[PDB]
Design a protein around this nucleic acid. Structure first.
Lengths: 170, 173
DNA sequence: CTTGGTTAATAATTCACCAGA
DNA sequence: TCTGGTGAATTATTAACCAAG
């Protein structure tokens, strides 16, 4: 079961962390929040949907060094620190639209450069070849940590990454 | 309250039905490029099209900027809109939509800035008219005193926010 | 299956807009 | 004479179906 996602002493840590970041340099902290969001391909939307921060604003702050009031940044830094409810999910092999991580794509291109063939066999030869990459890229790495949740490479996807790439070239 | 007392002309419409009827045979993409260049030049919000072409924003874009296949009926709504749109040639003649900076105006504003960020209202309303020139010129009809740029007509306030923004554009890099 | 068509979503961008010093 | 902060709006880009050879 779950009985850990809430510890006062532990939480204190979360909180204490936010006040170290809200004292650090915003853009330094920002590009940290970005890198994570990147590494873990987390829908920008998921953040907004919860911090109540303005999409345009957030984007502008994470990609451009646009000024964000402390209280706001507090909202972000928190969500960020509390988000590691995600490692608990990659630690226990036990919505959001799927997103192709750069890692999986760099290879998705192979089969294409090699042979745009959609073989439901030489597909898996990449499905777990992507997921192994996705898992690697984002800290963890057990070929089996299924904590990829919604970003997990599947054939309800790979087949499409080829399909689409097809409808492209002329 | 400008007039268009021929707006509903027999021949006039007849010709419209024929041209869309033509492009509809022409290469779908060559037409797009055409529709795109018009939209670009006159800096028309893609959105204005979508609202009245009942076409899918994503779709309209993909077709116009990429080689995305669109079935006839829609591409029909497009052209029809396109040719009907070329009505506003009246607006530029007979001397509600978010404003936008055409390239010609912008390439000119960078100087008035890289030169010296001087936002002197003495120099602002000087620029408004200089860009407002390029705009008309870039888009044929050059009757400067023909506020035909309508929603896209450069104003003192714009150049302000522009300069303002560009300055504040110099943040964490 | 897959290619013509098509889009709900997501997010970068653009242009503003406002509070004070 | 703006400038930190902010955001409603617009649009390129995503990852999808879906009908039908």
């Amino acid at each position: 079961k779950e009985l850990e996602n809430l510890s006062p002493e532990e939480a204190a840590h979360q909180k204490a962390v936010v006040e170290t970041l809200l004292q650090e340099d915003p853009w330094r902290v920002a590009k940290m929040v970005k890198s994570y969001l990147q590494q873990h391909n987390i829908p920008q939307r998921e953040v907004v949907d919860t911090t109540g921060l303005n999409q345009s604003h957030l984007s502008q702050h994470l990609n451009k060094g646009t000024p964000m009031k402390t209280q706001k940044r507090a909202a972000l830094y928190t969500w960020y620190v509390r988000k590691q409810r995600e490692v608990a999910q990659q630690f226990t092999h036990a919505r959001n639209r799927f997103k192709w991580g750069p890692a999986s794509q760099q290879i998705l291109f192979q089969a294409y450069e090699r042979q745009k063939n959609p073989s439901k066999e030489e597909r898996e030869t990449l499905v777990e070849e992507c997921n192994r990459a996705e898992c690697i890229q984002r800290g963890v790495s057990p070929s089996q940590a299924q904590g990829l949740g919604s970003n997990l490479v599947t054939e309800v996807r790979v087949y499409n990454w080829f399909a689409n790439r097809r409808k492209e070239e002329a």
